[PDB]
Design brief:
The structure is cut from a larger assembly and holds chains A, B and C. By secondary structure, chain A is mostly beta strands. The radius of gyration of chain A is 21 Å and the shape is flat. Chain A starts with 20 loop residues before the first strand and ends in a 45-residue tail after the last helix. Chain B has seven helices and six strands. The termini of chain B are far apart. In chain B, the strands form two sheets. Chain B has a three-stranded parallel beta sheet with strand order 1-2-4. In chain B, strands 3-5-6 form a three-stranded parallel beta sheet, covered by helices on one side. A four-stranded antiparallel beta sheet of chain C has the order 2-1-4-3, with no helix packed on it. Chain C is an alpha+beta fold. Classes of the chains: A mainly beta, B alpha/beta, C alpha+beta. The interface between B and C is small, with 6 and 6 residues. Chain A binds 13 RNA strands through strand 1.
Chain lengths: ~170, ~160, ~110
RNA sequence: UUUUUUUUUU
RNA sequence: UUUUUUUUUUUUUUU
RNA sequence: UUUUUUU
RNA sequence: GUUAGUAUGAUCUCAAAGUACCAGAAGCCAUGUGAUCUAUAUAGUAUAACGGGACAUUAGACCGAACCUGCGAUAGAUAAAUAUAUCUUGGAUGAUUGUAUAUUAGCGGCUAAAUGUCAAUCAAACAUGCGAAUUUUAGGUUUUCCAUGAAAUCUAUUUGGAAGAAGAGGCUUGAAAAAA
RNA sequence: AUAUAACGGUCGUAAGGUACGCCGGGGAUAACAGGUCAGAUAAUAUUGGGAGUUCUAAUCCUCGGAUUGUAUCAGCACCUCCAUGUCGGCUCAUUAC
RNA sequence: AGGAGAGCGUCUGUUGUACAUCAACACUAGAUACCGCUAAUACCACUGUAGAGGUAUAGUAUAUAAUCCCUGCCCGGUGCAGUAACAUGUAAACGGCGGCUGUUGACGGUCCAAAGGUAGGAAAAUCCUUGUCGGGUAAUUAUCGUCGUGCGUGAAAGUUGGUCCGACUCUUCACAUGUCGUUUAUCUAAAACUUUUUGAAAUAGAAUUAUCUUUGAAUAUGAGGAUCGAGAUGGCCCGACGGUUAGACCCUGAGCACCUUUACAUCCCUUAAAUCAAA
RNA sequence: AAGGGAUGUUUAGCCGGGAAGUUAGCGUCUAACAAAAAAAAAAAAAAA
RNA sequence: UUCUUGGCAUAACGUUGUGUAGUUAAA
RNA sequence: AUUAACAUAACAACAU
RNA sequence: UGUGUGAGAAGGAGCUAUACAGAUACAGGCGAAGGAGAAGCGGGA
RNA sequence: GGACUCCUUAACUUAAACUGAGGAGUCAAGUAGGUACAAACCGUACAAGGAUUAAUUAUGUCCAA
RNA sequence: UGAUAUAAUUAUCGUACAAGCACUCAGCUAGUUAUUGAGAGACACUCACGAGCCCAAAA
RNA sequence: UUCGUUGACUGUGUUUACCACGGGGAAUUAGAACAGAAUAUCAAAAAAAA
């Protein structure tokens, strides 16, 4: 008999996998430049006849940007929030601008997955859920004082809020 | 083998860098009394005081543009703009004299020579450096050539 | 290797500032001159950039070593030396890469010319 | 002869 | 009808 | 130291 | 009344060292010996042996003794012998046999041509080497007690198989002592 | 301005045989013997259909499934490890139906 | 080591081998190529020696194999010879030599090529380990004769073979015969036993060493159950994967060692080319 | 620059005992695990 | 308080070296 | 004169 | 606060290294509108 | 670049101790006990050390015990 | 007499066990060395001086 | 509208998504600041013999 050996047969195989999916959970502090959700522009045939979840992409919400490969990235210093759409049956990622402070257990409710009907409603909810206004502010609860972590290439594992280190003002937050 | 070449590294590594000297150390030495401010301080005194081991020429540099409290007339081969400004603000002086490899040795170690040498003439590069420092405001002491005088007589 | 059929053009500034740009065009438009209005740092002004009609035995490591060892076909190297000499180079003053041809003992101290 | 020589300083 | 099972290491099934 | 068989 | 470096003595061999934990191949190159065994027709400086028969008849003729050699069978195979013992082996007037002293030396010679032979396992001989031999295989690695305590996973190496080399990952973080 | 498409990149357009096979470490002679496996297949019984055609079971051919077993064929692993066409004959033997 | 049929075949002579148990080399003979003397060729110190103190009936090289026998076609092809200063001649030098289709078929169509197996032998040192028929035997597929299809070989590549010849396979005839169904008697001894003299080797982790069954994919004197009354010497060889060292296959070797249309790299030699001797 | 004779060195993937075919960058298609996934233990209503 | 822009690529360009090109009126 | 392996001898034992 | 994930010489019909100086970048602006009928021109700004 | 078992599942003859995946235990590197006889199964208040002591566990209770 | 017990060593997923060595004893025998190195999130001892430390070869 | 344009510009800086490393390179922010030269769009127009 005969048999055609596929080009992708062992050992010649794909080593890098398409790690497509969310990269930040709810109530997760983020800063501009961080990728929130990764996606791919490649689309397969017969998308409407599959069981897998990776074939579906998410839509942008509030304080988000779409990159070249359709990646959703943050645009402000805040926490990640998720929301569902009834009109479309698709999740939407939202970012609430917030300052660096201790996360209390009584504020967890602010980051709950809610259902919406419209983008307008999305924003309206966002507004209500937002802690405080930039122009008015509030009293921070145990804000950080120590400098940030060292570069990755320097040290992969750095101590957070080192007592040894001196106190430095925070200006990036604002 | 992956990163490309970087000629800038080994090209600048072979450069003859002058020996730096912070003004804070000079102030501490003056306060301690190792150096006498009543006269002009020179590389001979600096070397004999064990402050900085002079081998090719002392240079002066300031930090944070800190002002100089005292007033002195130092003689060094070069100095930074901040140091020159700080020394001149109070009323100090910075004197620069041209000396080659032999002349520097002679000046620092006169006892090593039975017959003292003669000062040599500078080249184009050194003349340009001296004239550049003259604009900065250092008292330059060197013999001028004829080609410069001739040209200047018309340029003026 | 790339299989691109696109032609390589060369745009030069009209100011004689030795400023050039890099781009590509389709192969069908062979007899077509490109002209643009790009920034020229040589004059701090927007000047015209026109497409220029830009048009040999290559020397390898092996060849070089052979030449240097045996001493055959030294004219190839001597031509480059003459070109370099003719062009502004080998200057005593204001030069670090190659101030001089060789030292007093006949050596090339600068590895990178 | 080698190395080191604060970036702070009312 | 039940207690007695692969108790299939041996005897025994004494209900 | 066996149980069960409505009225 | 705000800088903290420099240089010794221990331990160890972690990409150091004309040796690098130890023992242990085939084999290459250089300088020497060997023709007293063996191959070349003993190449005249020298040189010996062959009893008889068939009216075979000057011949590659036949039987056959000495001489050279040793088919088959048996035994031996730790030997009466590291190729011997019995018998009707073949040649024996011819590319017969035999002898003193001699020549050809290994990057070779000899070869009526077998990879047969050159000092009793030669498709490349033997002796010596401060030319001080190499190994991803594989053997060995020597007194006790205590503390802590793995992996057989990933990229790359045209990726292997009996984990070779290089990188990453994996460890000492915490806790867990209480009466109106 | 050419190559590295063997594209983690020395290709330098530089190939085959050895039954003359020495050294080192592993167990495989070109049907992969044995053990294990039970696809084909074997034993008993059963059912459908066709012979015996008076008659479904005196007797014979064939099909499906189930139990037991493995002679032979194919396949053959991580297990095992002697030397062969994976024996031909001679001598001397044991067990089951 | 005899009588007869038949296959193969130059021995005498040298030697243990290019596969399936059945070889080679050498030679009487013929034929081809080079060479006119300081010959060619060989050794490879180069004004040398052998050849040879020879002279085309001489010397040297390659291949074939009988004294004879009638001995086919092809130069498109590497190389050599020649020169239009790259026709033409050499197959006894140098690899070899075929498709469809129509009437047992002389004959007709078409493709390709330098040429398109000649004759002979032919179930074969070759296909196939039972091709048809005849001779022998109570049986013959073994073997001879023959047919020439079943596959196929193939002419100085050496084919075929009259006569003669034989340490070359096989068929078949004759005498005796313990080869035999199936085994006896006597004797001898470098056979065996006892004594005298004298005195090894292989091996050896330890030991006080079990029959049946079942466990362990390899495997039981040592593990579970049952059963079971010890030793020494002579004899046999069913187990203890019995002991030793004959043969023999494979590799991840990034290991040697030989041969070679690896002609890739290098060396030597012969062409070519240059220099001095040299007015 | 051509010819002859010598020397040295190379000829590497992967299943598979071996040979052959097939294949070698990047990208990309095909997926099964349950009931505090059931108001189906713990819930609701009580006219408690 | 400014109304926009450093292309296009659902296959994205072969790293390093050589060659070419470019830079040095300075301590 | 001299350790071990190895070779021989004497004494010691009774709920047997 | 609930997602990523195709290993085995397993299956399939995966497979192509390419385009553009522009009615392929492109500010502003515009842009397709049922059925029947006419025309027989594969036309949205 | 791992040996047995539990759930899901690719290949094979719904075969094989094979070949290869997802996530728990054990062995590897674990003692003594149970399972009749040889790592992987159950149990463990699991082996610093010594002595003549008490306990609900897998599991047993006619004899070998 | 009763009860109980699988020589040792290395490799290996595997006490792997019918694989490799060993009759026994005596002697020898396998991690040696910083005038030249060092603390690098898989582990790094200690003495002197101090913004100053060391001093090479002659001697 | 059959409309404009060449920004597919030129410099300073070492902070950030992922992470064996390499190629920040299946491709992330205004590093929101600073020093030059280009293109596109402006904005406003209320009160009608009670």
């Amino acid at each position: 008999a005969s048999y055609r050996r596929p080009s992708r047969a062992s050992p010649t195989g794909q080593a890098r996998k398409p790690h497509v999916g969310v990269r930040r959970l709810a109530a997760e502090y983020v800063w501009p430049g961080v990728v929130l959700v990764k996606q791919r522009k490649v689309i397969a045939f017969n998308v409407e006849t599959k069981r897998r979840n990776r074939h579906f992409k998410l839509y942008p919400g509030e304080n988000v940007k779409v990159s070249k490969v359709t990646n959703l990235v943050a645009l402000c210093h805040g926490r990640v929030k998720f929301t569902h759409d009834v009109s479309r049956d698709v999740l939407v990622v939202n970012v609430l601008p917030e300052r660096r402070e201790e996360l209390l257990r009584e504020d967890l409710w602010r980051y709950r997955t809610e259902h919406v009907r419209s983008m307008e409603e999305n924003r309206h909810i966002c507004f209500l859920r937002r802690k405080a206004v930039r122009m008015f502010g509030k009293e921070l609860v145990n804000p950080p004082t120590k400098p940030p972590l060292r570069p990755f290439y320097f040290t992969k594992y750095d101590s957070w809020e080192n007592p040894a280190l001196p106190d430095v003002p925070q200006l990036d937050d604002d | 083998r992956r990163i490309p070449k970087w000629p800038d590294a080994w090209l600048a590594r072979q450069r003859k860098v002058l020996e730096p000297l912070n003004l804070a150390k000079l102030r501490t030495f003056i306060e301690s009394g190792r150096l006498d401010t009543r006269f002009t301080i020179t590389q001979r005194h600096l070397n004999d005081s064990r402050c900085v081991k002079v081998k090719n020429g002392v240079s002066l540099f300031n930090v944070n543009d800190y002002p100089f409290p005292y007033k002195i007339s130092i003689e060094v081969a070069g100095a930074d703009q901040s140091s020159i400004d700080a020394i001149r603000r109070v009323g100090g002086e910075v004197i620069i004299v041209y000396r080659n490899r032999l002349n520097l040795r002679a000046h620092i170690k006169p006892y090593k020579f039975e017959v003292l040498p003669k000062t040599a003439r500078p080249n184009l590069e050194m003349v340009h450096y001296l004239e550049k420092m003259r604009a900065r405001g250092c008292v330059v002491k060197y013999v001028k050539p004829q080609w410069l005088i001739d040209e200047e007589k018309s340029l003026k | 290797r790339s299989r691109s059929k696109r032609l390589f053009v060369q745009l030069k500034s009209a100011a004689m500032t030795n400023f050039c740009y890099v781009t590509r065009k389709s192969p069908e438009k062979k007899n077509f001159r490109i002209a643009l209005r790009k920034y020229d740092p040589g004059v701090n002004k927007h000047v015209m950039f026109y497409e220029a009609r830009l048009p040999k035995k290559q020397i390898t490591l092996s060849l070089q070593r052979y030449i240097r060892w045996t001493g055959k076909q030294v004219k190839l190297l001597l031509d480059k030396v003459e070109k370099a000499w003719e062009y502004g180079r080998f200057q005593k003053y204001f030069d670090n890469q190659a101030p001089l041809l060789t030292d007093r003992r006949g050596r090339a101290v600068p590895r990178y010319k």
